[PDB]
Amino acid sequence: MNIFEMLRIDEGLRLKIYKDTEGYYEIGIGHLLTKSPSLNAAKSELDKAIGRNTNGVITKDEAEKLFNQDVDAAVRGILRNAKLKPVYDSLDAVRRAALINMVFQMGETGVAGFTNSLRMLQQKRWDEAAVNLAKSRWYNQTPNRAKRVITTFRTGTWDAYK
């Protein structure tokens, strides 16, 4: 299993602009368009992104293109983040996926804020980390997603995705 499969499962695929549970505008496979509460702004960003007047509806191909770019950006951000890199590099392939999943969902900064959890992951204190990862806003916002990712850090396997 990989990061790409993992995300597709967790983010889903939608061709028309929609709102996430927090009220923000996205499209495709979880591509965030804007946090502004204006559909017109969301369409505007989209057109910019896509390169054409899409009227808020993209194709599956277009969706995939954005998806690849987004995951690439996530990796790149981890790799240049002083606080994310060492942790990331300390991890096995499975757990690296879980870290990229978080970054994709919250951004480099948001993830850099789980000070405690990050410290524990680095020390391989899986169970400990898992508890701290649960004491967060993230966990209350998207509990089923968070559980899955947490278990993956906990176990180092993809069981949670079966």
Curated annotation (Swiss-Prot):
SUPFAM superfamilies: Lysozyme-like. Substrate binds at L32, F104, S117, N132. Its EC number is 3.2.1.17. The active site is at E11 (proton donor/acceptor), D20 (proton donor/acceptor). It is found in: Host cytoplasm. Gene3D superfamilies: 1.10.530.40. It catalyses: Hydrolysis of (1->4)-beta-linkages between N-acetylmuramic acid and N-acetyl-D-glucosamine residues in a peptidoglycan and between N-acetyl-D-glucosamine residues in chitodextrins. This is Endolysin. It comes from Enterobacteria phage T4 (Bacteriophage T4).
